Amino acid sequence: GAYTGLPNKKPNVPTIRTAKVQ
């Protein structure tokens, strides 16, 4: 669902939340 799955939603614009962190 989510880009990672931690939150788990559905959509995922980004490829990884790690990108936002970086």
Number of strands: 0
Proportion of residues in extended strands = under 5%
By oligomeric state, this entry counts as monomer
What structural class is derived from the secondary structure elements? mainly alpha
Structure, explained:
It is a single chain. The chain is mainly alpha-helical and 22 residues long. 23% of the residues lie in helices and 0% in strands. The N and C termini lie far apart (22 Å).
Task: Please describe the topology of this protein.
Elements lengths: L16 H5 L1
Summary?
The PDB classes it as viral protein. This protein has one helix and no strands.
Question: What key attributes describe this structure?
Answer:
mainly alpha; 1 helix; globular
